[PDB]
Amino acid sequence: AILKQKNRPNRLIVDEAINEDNSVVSLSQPKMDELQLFRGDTVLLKGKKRREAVCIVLSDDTCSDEKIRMNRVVRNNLRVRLGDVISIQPCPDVKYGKRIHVLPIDDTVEGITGNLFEVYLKPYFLEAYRPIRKGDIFLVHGGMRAVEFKVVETDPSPYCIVAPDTVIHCEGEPIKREDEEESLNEVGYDDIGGCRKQLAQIKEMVELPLRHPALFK
Amino acid sequence: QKLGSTAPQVLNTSSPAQQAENEAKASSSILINEAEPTTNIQIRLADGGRLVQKFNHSHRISDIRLFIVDARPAMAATSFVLMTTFPNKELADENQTLKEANLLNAVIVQRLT
Amino acid sequence: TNRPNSIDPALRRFGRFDREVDIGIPDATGRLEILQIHTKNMKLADDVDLEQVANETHGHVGADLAALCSEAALQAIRKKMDLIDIDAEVMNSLAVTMDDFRWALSQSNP
C-alpha cells in the first residue's frame, strides 16, 4: 500500500494486574489453551526497548481472561507502557544461581549490606524458583520490609532460576535509586512523534540489517 | 566445595545414548488413551534442566514415579518431595491422581531430599 | 572526474592528460539497455515493459536507475509484507509491477 508498516502482528497483549506474586504473573486460560502453555511453566514476555521479562505464567483469572496482565513492579522491570505487545516463546531457563550478584539499594531494607545471610535470602528466596534476571530491580517480601534490590547480572544464561536449597550469594555495595526510565535513552517510537511517515521511512531503510540479511535476493 | 547443609546432587549416571532409549522405553511403558482428554506434566529434574512431556489423561503420582524410574534408572533410589509453582504446597499422597490433586497441565517441580 | 575545469589546467597540457572523453548520460534505448543489464538477477513479474519506464526517465544517470530498481524491490518487500523469523514463502513470490515502477519514479531524485 502507500505505507505498509506500523503493523501489529499476531502478538499477545499487555495490561496491568493486581496479583501479589512478583515472579509469578497471570496469563489467560483460553490463551493458555491456545498457545499450549502449561500451568506452572515460565516463559519470556518480549516487551519493547530491548527488554524482556521472565516470569511464571499461571492459569489465574485474577487478571484479564483475554489480556495477559502483570504486576506494577514487573511493569517497571519491563519498562513498557500500557497496551503494548509481547511475543510468546516456551524456551526454558532452568539454571541455578552461582555466585555474588546483587547490589543493595537502601530504601526500606533489613541488614543494609546483607551479604548472603538475610531474612529475604535464606527463608524467602529459597523454595521459590524465581527466575533471577540481569537488571532485576525487584520489590519482593522478606526481611520485614518491602525490600528493593538491584542485580547486576546472573552468571549462567543471564535469565535463570534460583535454587530451593542453594542460598543466593550477595555482593556488598551501598548504591541508591537509579533513573532507568531516561538513563540509557531508552525512549523509542513511543516518545517521538516527529514525522511518523519519516519514522516509517527510517524503519524501511533499516529493515534489511534488522534480522533479515538474506532478504537481498 | 563448601560444607553446606544442602543435599548432594546426583549427576547423569545414564549414558547419552541410553537417555533416548530410556525416554523411548518410558513413552512405550505408558499407555495413551484417545477417548479421554490427555494432559502433559512437566517434571523439573535437578540434574541439569531436563523436562519430559509424555503422559495420559489420568495417572497417579506413583505412576509419575514409575515414569521417572523408566526415564532414569539412577533416580529410582533418591527420595524426592515434589513441588508446584506458588501455591506453596508439597505433593505427597502418591496414590492420588492428577484430577483430584489439580495437576492438569501443571508443572511439577522435583526437589531431592 | 565530475568536472573538467575544476582540475588544474597545468595538468591538461600537451605532454600529460591529452585525450578527453566523457561518458555522459545514456539515451532512452540506452537506459532500456541499462535496465536490461541491471535487472538480470531479479525476478520481474513479466508485465513490466522497461521501455515505457525508460521513456519516462529523461535526464537520469545509471546509478539513479539502480536506485529506482532498489526502491522497486523495496516496494515489493513492503507491499507483500510478512511475519517475523526465515519465512521462505516470500522468497519465491517476489514481483515488481510497472505501477510499482511508476510509484518509485514518483519518489525519485534524479
Swiss-Prot record, chain A:
Documented effect of changing Y96A: Abolishes interaction with NPLOC4
PTM characteristics: Phosphorylated by tyrosine kinases in response to T-cell antigen receptor activation. Phosphorylated in mitotic cells. ISGylated.
Cell compartments where the protein resides: Cytoplasm, Cytosol; Endoplasmic reticulum; Nucleus; Cytoplasm, Stress granule
Superkingdom of origin organism: Eukaryota
Positions bearing Phosphoserine: S23
Consequence recorded when altering R39A: Minor effect on affinity for ATP and ADP
Cross-link Glycyl lysine isopeptide (Lys-Gly) (interchain with G-Cter in SUMO2), where in sequence: K4
Disease per UniProt entry: Inclusion body myopathy with early-onset Paget disease with or without frontotemporal dementia 1: An autosomal dominant disease characterized by disabling muscle weakness clinically resembling to limb girdle muscular dystrophy, osteolytic bone lesions consistent with Paget disease, and premature frontotemporal dementia. Clinical features show incomplete penetrance.
Family indicated by similarity: Belongs to the AAA ATPase family.
The record's note on its domains: The PIM (PUB-interaction motif) motif mediates interaction with the PUB domain of RNF31.
Subunit field text: Homohexamer. Forms a ring-shaped particle of 12.5 nm diameter, that displays 6-fold radial symmetry. Part of a ternary complex containing STX5A, NSFL1C and VCP. NSFL1C forms a homotrimer that binds to one end of a VCP homohexamer. The complex binds to membranes enriched in phosphatidylethanolamine-containing lipids and promotes Golgi membrane fusion. Binds to a heterodimer of NPLOC4 and UFD1, binding to this heterodimer inhibits Golgi-membrane fusion. Interaction with VCIP135 leads to dissociation of the complex via ATP hydrolysis by VCP.
Functional note: Necessary for the fragmentation of Golgi stacks during mitosis and for their reassembly after mitosis. Involved in the formation of the transitional endoplasmic reticulum (tER). The transfer of membranes from the endoplasmic reticulum to the Golgi apparatus occurs via 50-70 nm transition vesicles which derive from part-rough, part-smooth transitional elements of the endoplasmic reticulum (tER). Vesicle budding from the tER is an ATP-dependent process.
The protein's name: Transitional endoplasmic reticulum ATPase
Organism: Homo sapiens (Human)
Organism lineage string: Eukaryota, Metazoa, Chordata, Craniata, Vertebrata
Gene field: VCP
UniProtKB/Swiss-Prot annotation, chain B:
Tissues where this protein is expressed: Highly expressed in heart, brain, spleen, lung, liver, muscle, kidney and testis.
Localization of this protein: Nucleus; Golgi apparatus, Golgi stack; Chromosome; Cytoplasm, Cytoskeleton, Microtubule organizing center, Centrosome
Chain ranges of the UBX domain: 34-111
Modification type Phosphoserine: residues: S15
Superkingdom of the source species: Eukaryota
Modification after translation, per record: Phosphorylated during mitosis. Phosphorylation inhibits interaction with Golgi membranes and is required for the fragmentation of the Golgi stacks during mitosis.
Sequence intervals crossing the membrane: none
Family: Belongs to the NSFL1C family.
Assembly and oligomerization: Part of a ternary complex containing STX5A, NSFL1C and VCP. NSFL1C forms a homotrimer that binds to one end of a VCP homohexamer. The complex binds to membranes enriched in phosphatidylethanolamine-containing lipids and promotes Golgi membrane fusion. Interaction with VCIP135 leads to dissociation of the complex via ATP hydrolysis by VCP. Binds ubiquitin and mono-ubiquitinated proteins via its N-terminal UBA-like domain when bound to VCP.
Function: Reduces the ATPase activity of VCP. Necessary for the fragmentation of Golgi stacks during mitosis and for VCP-mediated reassembly of Golgi stacks after mitosis. May play a role in VCP-mediated formation of transitional endoplasmic reticulum (tER). Inhibits the activity of CTSL (in vitro). Together with UBXN2B/p37, regulates the centrosomal levels of kinase AURKA/Aurora A during mitotic progression by promoting AURKA removal from centrosomes in prophase. Also, regulates spindle orientation during mitosis.
Protein name in UniProt: NSFL1 cofactor p47
Organism, as annotated: Rattus norvegicus
Higher taxonomy: Eukaryota, Metazoa, Chordata, Craniata, Vertebrata
Protein's gene: Nsfl1c
Entire-sequence positions represented here: 258 to 370 of 370
